[PDB]
Amino acid sequence: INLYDSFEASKKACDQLSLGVAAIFGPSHSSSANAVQSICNALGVPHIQTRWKHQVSDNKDSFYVSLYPDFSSLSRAILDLVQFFKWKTVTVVYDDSTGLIRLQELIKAPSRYNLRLKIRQLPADTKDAKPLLKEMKRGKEFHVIF
């Protein structure tokens, strides 16, 4: 399929289900993954997911698995690493807007621990880390989570 064309992934999933298939190894996007998950949950066919997607808590679908490790446990491991290194000022730099969901335990961590977090977002261009790192010069922040 193409880049984030969930209708095309739905059509290919319908064609592969018409051909007959044991289980569907789904796409690596988010929207097409949600579409294939809902389609196979309607038709009783097991879904396999290898990349993490954001999961809506209202969804009652049960016909899927996810072999990427959950970012709740990953974020708790990162918080344990921060507690082991005994940091105080952490600058967290992400690139995609879903990453705040992936690191939300670290953002909820200043309520329960003693920390101070400054988060920043990479720009939409690849080579534009030079202004953002300049803020790393200005903030004097030496503990960066990428």
Add this chain to the structure above:
Amino acid sequence: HVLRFGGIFEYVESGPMGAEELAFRFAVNTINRNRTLLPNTTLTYDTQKINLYDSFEASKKACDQLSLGVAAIFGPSHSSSANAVQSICNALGVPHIQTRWKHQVSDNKDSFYVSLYPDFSSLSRAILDLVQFFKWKTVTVVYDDSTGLIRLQELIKAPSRYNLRLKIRQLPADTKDAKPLLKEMKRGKEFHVIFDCSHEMAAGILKQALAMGMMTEYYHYIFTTLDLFALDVEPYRYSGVNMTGFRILNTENTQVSSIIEKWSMERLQAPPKPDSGLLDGFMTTDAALMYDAVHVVSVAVQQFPQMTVSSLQCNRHKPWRFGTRFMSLIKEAHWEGLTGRITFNKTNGLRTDFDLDVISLKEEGLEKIGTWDPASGLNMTESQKGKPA
């Protein structure tokens, strides 16, 4: 002439009819009764009843609607269903109008969708302007849904651009379990809370905060939701909380009040809920946005008389004949609706320009104390009280 619109609405089993579908059909009936707008064209609808948080049902109903053929589709509220509907109609060139915010992936390349919910980037910048007006230092942000951090993506990301320290807490899965969260709120001695939830959850946690004794002169709650006029502030107006928030629903104009009154007796069929704490007989923001969406797509239709509805097939990818012209006609309209001035970003489908009224809670109830605009800053007419000679 006869024109057809696509209506997808997530229905509730039993009960009354849904509010958004009622607003959609009320907008259709008021446009059909009026002759100043669309003089020689009549509008029809095809409403659908899909499940909540499902995309395959929405895909099947959208395919059935394109088998019937519609001019445009008014999508559902859940993010997955709206994403599937948006991809389906962008594959066929039929324009999409959505009234609820959804998280949008930056790698998406669709161009046949518009969203009339105000963008939370501009809303969060307005909230930052409101916070910087109040000279705050420590802000506790309480968010309900896990997507809501993206809705506060500008607000959370404030690294040393202003002297501000944030503490972020999440509401629990149960609605009634705010009491341990409010107990940690009280013991933490933090008194400037930004609540990001729906209006029903806001009324519920206001009842919980009243039961926790959080209603003093020390608390200055800020609600990101726009339905604060649906709240009943009668058991809180004499307390001394400040309760500043925003409103897009321009109730100052008399014609908008007349449209609200004409909505009201069709709205008062449903009985009120006294346990909810919501002021019954009022427009939500979603219903007004659906009404304004129908008006914007109608005035986009009126400039394009060569409008033939053609039935399309999901099994092929044959695009609509009048796709790009009608999409560009949609993406440049300027209609005065219930929310005021309506325009679209020309590089997006997001309504990034609006005119918010900053309201607050005083002893008379709720009243307008300021005006926010994205092009200007924040007026805040109580600070404009100093006019020396």
Add this chain to the structure above:
Amino acid sequence: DCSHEMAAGILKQALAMGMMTEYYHYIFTTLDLFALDVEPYRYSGVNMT
């Protein structure tokens, strides 16, 4: 110093104004304090002896 019904009305009007916190403290001369409804006032933290 009032009746228990008057005490309940005063407590409701004090909750409407946000009078009771952990700062405040009430003594009731009436002997029907156990017959009142202390459900909404309990979790805020009020002495109310």
